[PDB]
């Protein structure tokens, strides 16, 4: 199949405004949220129907208990960081863990943390070590690496457990995750630029580009973002500016899910 990824996020806020949760945890398969938990509901809930239909209530009961424990642990870790940064006010602590099963069968795994939305600690499961960005992170790094068993544990989880969960979730939601809706592609003009617009496609992974007389023009092209249309499909665009003094053969190229497409502007 195509490349797929599973990743879990945590967010902790030290002094949140009234109502806003102190802790939020969301999991994703590719772009799809699958799980959610926060300090307000204190329940772990599915965020995809195919997760709700395939995981029995004892699963959500168990992970509700785990997330309540991890919520308290995250609060303690954020308290430690902010005191050691000597920081006042509200600050954020984030975590991301997960893995990719690539098309060719190889795998990747990652685990990292952020403070105030910037890299803080990054795990290297091949050297079994943490990369620290400053001296507050360095202190944490020393503590986490003194426990060699915890490093081995995370390496095993990234390389074995994460990949096995992902394969399981891929089967559950295969009607969603493994489908293909090809893009509808058009070109129009909007001093003057050609816009190549695609929409109605899934998966969101798409490559659009312009070529001039057969050569690519990377430095001259404006790339739009891949945006959700709201119905489970996506849209994207790419524009290029027209030479008013000399004609050229411009063509839009779109690659999506193994099919290549060319729109030559006449």
């Amino acid at each position: 199949m195509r490349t797929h990824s599973l990743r879990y996020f945590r967010l902790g806020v030290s002094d949140p405004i009234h109502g806003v949760p102190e802790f939020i945890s969301v999991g994703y398969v590719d772009s799809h949220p699958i799980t959610t938990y926060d300090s307000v509901t204190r329940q772990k809930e599915p965020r995809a129907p195919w997760m709700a239909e395939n995981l029995a209530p004892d699963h959500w009961e168990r992970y509700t208990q785990l997330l309540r424990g991890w919520q308290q642990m995250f609060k303690v870790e954020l308290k430690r960081l902010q005191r050691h940064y000597n920081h006042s006010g509200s600050h954020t602590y984030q975590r991301m863990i997960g893995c990719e099963l690539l098309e060719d069968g190889s795998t990747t795994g990652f685990l990292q943390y952020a403070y105030d939305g910037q890299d803080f600690l990054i795990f290297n499961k091949d050297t079994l070590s943490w990369l620290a960005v400053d001296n507050v992170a360095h202190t944490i790094k020393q503590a986490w690496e003194a426990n060699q068993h915890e490093l081995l544990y995370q390496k095993n989880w990234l390389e074995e457990e994460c990949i096995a969960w992902l394969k399981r979730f891929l089967e559950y939601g295969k009607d969603t995750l493994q489908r293909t809706e090809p893009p509808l592609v058009r070109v129009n003009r909007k001093v003057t630029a050609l816009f190549c617009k695609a929409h109605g496609f899934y998966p969101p992974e798409i490559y659009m580009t312009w070529m001039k007389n057969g050569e690519e023009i990377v430095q001259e092209i404006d790339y739009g973002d891949i945006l959700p249309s709201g119905d489970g499909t996506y849209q994207a665009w790419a524009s290029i500016e027209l030479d008013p003094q000399s004609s050229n053969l411009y063509s839009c190229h779109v690659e999506h899910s193994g099919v290549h497409m060319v729109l030559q502007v006449p």
Epitope: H59, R62, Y63, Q65, L66, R68, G69, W70, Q72, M73, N147, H149, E150, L152, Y153, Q154, N156, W157, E160, E161, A164, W165
Partner: antibody, heavy 109, light 116 residues
Framework: GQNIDQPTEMTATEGAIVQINCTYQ??????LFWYQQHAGEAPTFLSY??LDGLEEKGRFSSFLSRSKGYSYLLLKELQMKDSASYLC??????????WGAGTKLIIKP | NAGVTQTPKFQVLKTGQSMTLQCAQD?????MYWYRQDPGMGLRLIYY???????DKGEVPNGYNVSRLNKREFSLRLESAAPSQTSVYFC??????????????FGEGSRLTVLE
């Protein structure tokens, strides 16, 4: 469904070597623990393995093969004080411990 | 300090009688567990407490209830003792739960005999 097996009882001679086996069939794997429990007392932690290979720790070494679903606790130069039950426990995919029934190690002086 | 302290060490019970087993830990742990140990089988979890302020059932919760009074204490309640609850009960704690390689620290154990 989820299953761990170890021998009920083993008998070896003082000063010899004994290898206590633990096989497990589980949904997922997050580590294998060995605990020592003297008769009438509490279990105490001995070792942890989560990757393949052999870890040493004094007279005790613990081995793990994840593909075979197999571990052993190796006790060298047996002494009378090694007479105890040895419990193997595996953490499954939801981080829940599945416990073996334990192996009673009898040492002949 | 003391580690895990559970009481009583021994108890005889008549069928239908109530009983509370106490357990405290002074290691600043967050997760606490109640196990029963019976001949010929592995430890079975009765109830557990992943952190202060939350508890949930284990493998064999029927006939028991628990209370995570605070961060230190986790009591086990037998409301109506049954002969099948004759067993050795162990309370344990760990720093966290789901933090991968953390081990359990056990109390001394409580031996219960329920008689008709």
């Amino acid at each position: 469904g989820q299953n761990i097996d170890q021998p009920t009882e083993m008998t070896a001679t003082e000063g010899a070597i004994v290898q206590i086996n633990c096989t497990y069939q589980t949904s997922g794997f997050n580590g294998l623990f060995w605990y020592q429990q003297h008769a009438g007392e509490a279990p105490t932690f001995l070792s942890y393995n989560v990757l393949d290979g052999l870890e040493e720790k004094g007279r005790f070494s613990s081995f793990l093969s994840r593909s075979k679903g197999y571990s052993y606790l190796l006790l060298k130069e047996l002494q009378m004080k090694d007479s105890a039950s040895y419990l193997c426990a595996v953490k499954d995919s939801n981080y829940q411990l599945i416990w073996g029934a334990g192996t009673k190690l009898i040492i002949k002086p | 300090n003391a580690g895990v302290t559970q009481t009583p060490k021994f108890q005889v019970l008549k069928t239908g009688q109530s009983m509370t087993l106490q357990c405290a830990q002074d290691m600043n742990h967050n997760s606490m567990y109640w196990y029963r140990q019976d001949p010929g089988m592995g430890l079975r979890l009765i109830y557990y407490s992943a952190s202060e302020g939350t508890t949930d059932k284990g493998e064999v919760p029927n006939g028991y209830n628990v209370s995570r009074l605070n961060k230190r204490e986790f009591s086990l309640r037998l409301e109506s003792a049954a002969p099948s609850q004759t067993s050795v009960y162990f309370c344990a704690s760990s720093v966290w739960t789901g933090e991968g390689s953390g081990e359990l620290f056990f109390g001394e154990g409580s031996r219960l005999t329920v008689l008709e």
